């Protein structure tokens, strides 16, 4: 039985290193959004709420975790607050991650009404609501779902604790049925699975829209070929009507509008000739469409594709951060499931408990790196802040 202060020293030093890095990186995130107007959008207000939670992991949750690792004598409800505050921050993180996913889904699925639906003032209200709900969820044990009514009196007496005090240890005061059914299953796992469903819908919507762009491009070029090798006016008419409906479908900005105005007008010109039975004249009119396709329509196609690809890239970055949250927190939740559901299993050893706690805390370090490596506007602003 090695002196407890030795393993404690390693755990505490690692926790302090994580707290430093969590504070520095996420202060840098908030500083960048504040300074750069190109970063001030609704998506990034949730990014700032998430960075604020991670700053508070460094400032408060990690000092609280160090404190509760000592088992110090405490009034049981004060111990509960120390134990549970990190659950507030994790819950707030989950709400921010879900909001970010939903924001990106609205932007990809209904871009025409995004800016009118998703506003900064509405985002700020949602963030406030989510922080209140996070306190209610994370501090639910302080409303009575706790083990303070059944203190471990033998452990309290062995530590010389006073009357009304307990040895402040997480699993002695926080009920494991709360931790597994309420905190994990209901408040963490279900939202993460909802996030997964939202991300699946985003990527499926992106895949469909790109396919629709390429299908309209092919339909344009196919029907031009049909007109060239048509042998009567009715065949020219058939292909032009399908081109005209497709042109309006791709129209659904001034040089954009001009290009489609020429295109639809040139289709109408050829359609009128077709309906007069002037096939050769209609086919010559339709050849003009190629100049418009080359000078205008292909540029719109390429720009639309480029916008969708950037949205896919941004949704992947957001999904990575949600996935890293799950990766860092799941081990601790899974261990709680073993403790709770398998009372015939030996408890996970202490070194593994503390490795899983450290891992969870490390999640508060990682997001600034994901933004730096994946989002140029963040990376460039970080550069300017550091250099200056
Ligand atoms: C706004 C921020 C900076 C203020 C931080 C206040 C924190 C540190 C305060 C608020 C309530 C406090 C707890 C309230 C009650 C108890 C029970 C006592 O037997 C031991 C200390 C303990 C566990 C306190 C520790 C410190 C504590 C968590
Ligand atoms: C900005 C918002 C979140 C305000 C934060 C204030 C919170 C952190 C403070 C304000 C008053 C504090 C409480 C005051 C008194 C007690 C009684 C004690 O037996 C257990 C701790 C407990 C319950 C404290 C926990 C922390 C507490 C709730
Ligand atoms: C989220 C991804 C990374 C998966 C993480 C799985 C981890 C948390 C799993 C894999 C193997 C698991 C261990 C397998 C067996 C035992 C022995 C038992 O007496 C206590 C729990 C304990 C020690 C488990 C704790 C949780 C555990 C370490
Ligand atoms: C998508 C995934 C990661 C969601 C989380 C899966 C969780 C809930 C699963 C993964 C492994 C599962 C555990 C595997 C083995 C045991 C030992 C058994 O004696 C009691 C149940 C228990 C403890 C399971 C509880 C639930 C569990 C922890
Ligand atoms: C409490 C301790 C941790 C708190 C961190 C709070 C970080 C919030 C402060 C950083 C603000 C950044 C921001 O979102 O500005 C953009 C808007 O101004 C656009 O209008
Ligand atoms: C997603 C959410 C998954 C929720 C499913 C939760 C299902 C749990 C049922 C259960 O555990 O009862 C068995 C008891 O004997 C345990 O002691
Ligand atoms: C996706 C969500 C998945 C949820 C899976 C939860 C399953 C967990 C259910 C475990 C029930 C159990 O372990 O009973 C054991 C008893 O015999 C007492 O030892
Ligand atoms: C304990 C409470 C801790 C933190 C409060 C949360 C602070 C979260 C700060 C986010 C602010 C924000 O995102 O602002 C949006 C913007 O102002 C819209 O116009
Ligand atoms: C916004 C920035 C402001 C900074 C935020 C504050 C930093 C919190 C530091 C430590 C919290 C842990 C403190 C809990 C210590 C309790 C130890 C104790 O009370 O020991 C006596 C007990 O009776 C056993 O005998
Ligand atoms: N089970 C658990 N334990 C602890 N700390 C106590 C580690 C421990 C466990 C058993 C023991 O005899 C002595 C120490 N922190 C913990 N934090 C969490 C947690 C936060 C979010 C999800 O799980 N679970 N959790
Ligand atoms: C991330 C960095 C990885 C390094 C992991 C080291 C951190 C914790 C495991 C060390 C074992 C500490 C035992 C805890 C003793 C106690 O607090 O009572
Ligand atoms: C991990 C941490 C990355 C921190 C990089 C250093 C930035 C410090 C500047 C600041 O605090 O704003
Ligand atoms: C520990 C908590 C620190 C939170 C860090 C967040 C920093 C970002 C924005 C705060 C607002 C800016 C304060 C001074 C602004 C100076 C200026 O704009 O010229
Ligand atoms: C920028 C402000 C950040 C706050 C700094 C806090 C750093 C202190 C860290 C941990 C405090 C641990 C207190 C130990 C509990 C008492 C042990 C015992 O009584 O047995
Ligand atoms: C900085 C130092 C943090 C102080 C933590 C001291 C408490 C250690 C006692 C213990 O773990 O048994
Ligand atoms: C502002 C930041 C204030 C930082 C406070 C730092 C540490 C608080 C922990 C001190 C508690 C030691 C208890 C002494 C004892 O138990 O005898
Ligand atoms: C549930 C907890 C209630 C919190 C009230 C916070 C105020 C937020 C109102 C703004 C709503 C919004 O603009 O969408
Ligand atoms: C419930 C008691 C504590 C609630 C504190 C929540 C803080 C509220 C809003 C954060 C500001 C977001 C803009
Ligand atoms: C811990 C369980 C949580 C309790 C759930 C019930 C309490 C919160 C309910 C609804 C919050 C909805 C926010 C409505 C604010 C007003 C909006 C507006 O004025 O436009
Ligand atoms: C908002 C919900 C959080 C309220 C929990 C604080 C209760 C304080 C106490 O137990 O004395
Ligand atoms: C909906 C979210 C808002 C929830 C918070 C509002 C009211 C709950 C307050 C309960 C008071 C805590 C006292 C607990 C105690 O002293 O035992
Ligand atoms: C346990 C659920 C795992 C999924 C975590 C969230 C996924 C987000 C990106 C895809
Ligand atoms: C390397 C870091 C951790 C890797 C795997 C975790 C597996 C730990 C299993 C130990 C069993 C504990 C026991 O004896 O009950
Ligand atoms: C103390 C360990 C913290 C390291 C977290 C890893 C963040 C990504 C690094 C590159
Ligand atoms: Na977080």
Structure notes:
It is a multi-pass membrane protein. Strands 1-2 form a two-stranded antiparallel ribbon. It is built from 13 helices and 2 strands. It is mostly helical and 388 residues long. It is elongated, with a radius of gyration of 30 Å. The protein has helices spanning 4-35, 42-69, 76-109, 111-117, 120-138, 153-158, 170-173, 176-228, 233-251, 254-275, 279-341, 350-374, 376-387; strands spanning 73-75, 165-167. The protein has a domain at 210-303: Four Helix Bundle (Hemerythrin (Met), subunit A), CATH 1.20.120.10. It starts with a helix and ends with a helix. The longest helix is centred in the last third of the chain and has 63 residues, at 279-341. The protein binds cholesterol (CLR) (4 copies), (2S)-2,3-dihydroxypropyl (9Z)-octadec-9-enoate (OLB) (3 copies), (2R)-2,3-dihydroxypropyl (9Z)-octadec-9-enoate (2 copies), the ligand Nc1nc(NCCc2ccc(O)cc2)nc2nc(-c3ccco3)nn12, oleic acid (14 copies) and sodium ion. One oleic acid binds at residues 17-18, 21, 362, 365-366, 369.
Write the layout of secondary structure elements.
Layout: H1 4-35, H2 42-69, E1 73-75, H3 76-109, H4 111-117, H5 120-138, H6 153-158, E2 165-167, H7 170-173, H8 176-228, H9 233-251, H10 254-275, H11 279-341, H12 350-374, H13 376-387
Antiparallel strand pairs: 1-2
Helix pairs in contact: 1-2, 1-12, 1-13, 2-3, 2-5, 2-12, 3-4, 3-5, 3-8, 3-11, 8-9, 8-11, 9-10, 10-11, 11-12, 12-13
